[PDB]
């Protein structure tokens, strides 16, 4: 209704699976409530990638829904696995080379100040020789810290 955007979610088949939801009825519910083009792709690295596209509002709900699904799962009494030792929450997003380069800014002053206050740590994919095109960033920390990093990067992206 106001402005459109695009966000590529990259996660491990296991983590993303918990987010997908049983019988895919949850992912169906996610889209219906999001309103922004939500799809899935491959990932020799992550295995699962959710391509979301749509106005800031649609995306706002989607991101809030997916994060909640992960919050409900962890706090649902895991009846499997043996300890995780991962108090924080990591989310690896995808972005073009131009996005990562600028997102970092001169001497990383930009990305540094963002993660410095956000309280979370941002990750960056490698680039062995001139082959890689898209860079994957991994933000770990508190759910509040993550949503903050996304809101800060988004607002700055539009306001350039």
Swiss-Prot record:
The cross-link described as Glycyl lysine isopeptide (Lys-Gly) (interchain with G-Cter in SUMO2) comes at 106
Query: Oligomeric state and partners?
Result: Identified in a mRNP complex, at least composed of DHX9, DDX3X, ELAVL1, HNRNPU, IGF2BP1, ILF3, PABPC1, PCBP2, PTBP2, STAU1, STAU2, SYNCRIP and YBX1. Interacts with IFIH1 and RNF135. Interacts with MAVS (via C-terminus) and ITCH (via WW domains). Interacts with CGAS; preventing the formation of liquid-like droplets in which CGAS is activated.
Q: What is this protein called?
A: Poly(rC)-binding protein 2
Q: What does this protein do?
A: Single-stranded nucleic acid binding protein that binds preferentially to oligo dC. Major cellular poly(rC)-binding protein. Also binds poly(rU). Acts as a negative regulator of antiviral signaling. Negatively regulates cellular antiviral responses mediated by MAVS signaling. It acts as an adapter between MAVS and the E3 ubiquitin ligase ITCH, therefore triggering MAVS ubiquitination and degradation. Negativeley regulates the cGAS-STING pathway via interaction with CGAS, preventing the formation of liquid-like droplets in which CGAS is activated. (Microbial infection) In case of infection by poliovirus, binds to the viral internal ribosome entry site (IRES) and stimulates the IRES-mediated translation. Also plays a role in initiation of viral RNA replication in concert with the viral protein 3CD.
Tissue specificity, in the record's words, reads: Detected in all tissues examined.
Q: Could you tell me the gene encoding this protein?
A: PCBP2
Give the organism the record lists: Homo sapiens (Human)
Using the record's annotation, list all stretches that form the KH domain.
Answer: 4-66, 88-153
Post-translational modification here is noted as: Phosphorylated. The non-phosphorylated form(s) exhibited the strongest poly(rC)-binding activity.
The record's comment about this protein's domains reads: The KH domains mediates poly(C) binding.
* Localization per Swiss-Prot or TrEMBL: Nucleus; Cytoplasm
